[PDB]
């Protein structure tokens, strides 16, 4: 059983205070702009679960900083492309006609984790407009980062990823690897190394639910591992533990710029 093993692998309980302290040790600082990706279970047993992680991040960064997390809702997309899992083709139009429109305060994430689910409904946390590829933010640049994401190229030059690059932010990975590192999508975009697809999603326009068509890049996270590996040789990724979780902290601009180059080749 999952929980039983999480407990048996923990020597002392992780708390808001021990996470805060592990975060500072790693090098998270007041006033930093940081995009966070995490696995709650990798930390080991935490008193207060996802709430403890979110409250600890906030205590360290404070309102002078900014915390961003991906809040993707890929269950709203066109089912023609579904693979985990696929549905019968005869359902496809029914889904396009009936799936509820994206509402930022309401639509759940998928595959982002409990930390993200706690974050996005936490008070004062703001979420971008995109029906499949939204981000949530909290703190000083929250509103600047999440406003006006374009429908097409959700992870591109007019997305929260670009605004983080411009603010010279950090990426914090907590018990996950480079394949969760969203920001490298920007490298794929700038090098033009991924394929394009025609997607759709339901939005609320003029007060009415419209199924909308647009273009996005077919982001493949699997080549991100390779990039991460080579990036780590060449310089600066601070590594440390938060509880049992292996974490990394790096500058987004450095990794994005390395990834762009890596793709030209």
CB of 116 to ligand ACO, least distance (A): 7
- In 3D space, the residue among 64, 81, 67, 63 whose CA is nearest the CA of residue 38 turns out to be 67
From its own copies, ligand ACO, none, interface partner of 12 (C-beta below 5 to 8 A by class):
its own copies
Chain breaks in the chain following residues, C–N > 2.5 Å? none
Is residue 55 involved in binding its own copies (CB under 8 A)?
A: yes
φ and ψ at residue 109, rounded to 5 degrees: -90, 170
CB of 99 to its own copies, least distance (A): 5
Say if residue 85 is preceded by a cis peptide, omega within 30 of 0: yes
Question: In this chain, which of 36, 50, 151, 189 binds its own copies, going by CB under 8 A?
Answer: 50
CB of 230 to its own copies, least distance (A): 32
Q: Tell whether residue 172 is among the known ligand binding residues.
A: no
**Order of strands across the sheet with 245-251?**
126-127, 135-139, 66-70, 33-38, 170-174, 245-251, 238-242
Strand partners, 209: 204
Is residue 75 involved in binding its own copies (CB under 8 A)?
A: yes
Report how far Cα 120 is from the mean position of its chain's Cα atoms: 11
Give the tokens for residue 58. Answer: 């906030």
Residue ranges in contact with ligand ACO by CB under 6 A: 1-3, 6, 37-43, 45-46, 49, 70, 72, 111-115, 176, 180, 182, 221
Q: Tell whether residue 66 is among the known ligand binding residues.
A: no
Instruction: 235-242: list long-range contacts, CB under 8 Å, 24+ apart.
Output: 238/26, 238/27, 239/26, 240/22, 240/25, 240/26, 241/22, 242/14, 242/19, 242/22, 242/23, 242/26, 242/43, 242/174, 242/175
Per-position x/- string for 120-139, each x denoting binding to its own copies as judged by CB under 8 A, each - no binding: -xxx----------------
Q: Tell whether residue 252 is among the known ligand binding residues.
A: no
Is residue 117 involved in binding its own copies (CB under 8 A)?
A: yes
Is residue 60 involved in binding its own copies (CB under 8 A)?
A: no
Is residue 186 involved in binding its own copies (CB under 8 A)?
A: no
Is residue 47 involved in binding its own copies (CB under 8 A)?
A: yes
Judged by CB under 8 A, how many residues of this single chain contact its own copies?
Answer: 39
List the binding residues for acetyl-CoA. 37-41, 46, 72, 111, 114, 180, 182
List the binding residues. 37-41, 46, 72, 82-85, 111, 114, 180, 182
List the binding residues for cytosine. 82-85
């Amino acid at each position: 059983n999952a929980m039983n093993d999480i407990v048996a692998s923990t020597q002392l309980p992780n708390t808001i205070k021990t996470i805060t302290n592990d975060l500072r040790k790693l090098g998270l600082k007041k006033g930093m702009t940081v995009i966070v990706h995490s696995s709650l279970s990798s930390i080991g047993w935490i008193s207060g679960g996802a709430v403890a992680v979110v409250e600890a991040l906030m205590e360290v960064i404070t309102e002078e900083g900014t915390i961003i997390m991906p809040t993707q809702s890929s269950d709203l997309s066109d089912p023609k492309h579904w693979s985990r899992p696929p549905v019968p083709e005869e359902w496809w139009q029914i889904i396009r006609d009936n799936v509820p429109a994206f509402e930022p305060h309401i639509t759940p994430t998928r595959a982002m984790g409990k930390v993200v689910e706690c974050f996005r409904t936490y008070p004062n946390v703001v979420r971008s407009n995109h029906p499949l590829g939204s981000f949530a933010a909290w703190g000083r640049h929250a509103e600047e980062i999440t406003v006006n994401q374009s429908l097409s190229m959700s992870l591109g030059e007019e997305s929260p990823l670009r605004k983080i690059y411009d603010l010279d932010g950090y990426i914090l990975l907590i018990g996950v690897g480079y394949d969760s590192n969203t920001s490298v999508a920007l490298s794929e975009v700038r090098s033009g190394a991924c394929e394009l697809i025609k997607v759709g999603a339901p939005i609320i326009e003029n007060g009415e639910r419209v199924w909308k068509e647009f273009v996005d890049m077919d982001y493949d996270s699997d080549k991100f591992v390779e990039i991460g590996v080579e990036f780590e040789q060449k310089g600066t990724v601070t590594m440390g533990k938060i509880g049992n979780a292996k974490c990394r902290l790096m500058k987004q601009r450095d990794i994005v710029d390395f990834g762009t180059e890596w793709f030209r080749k």
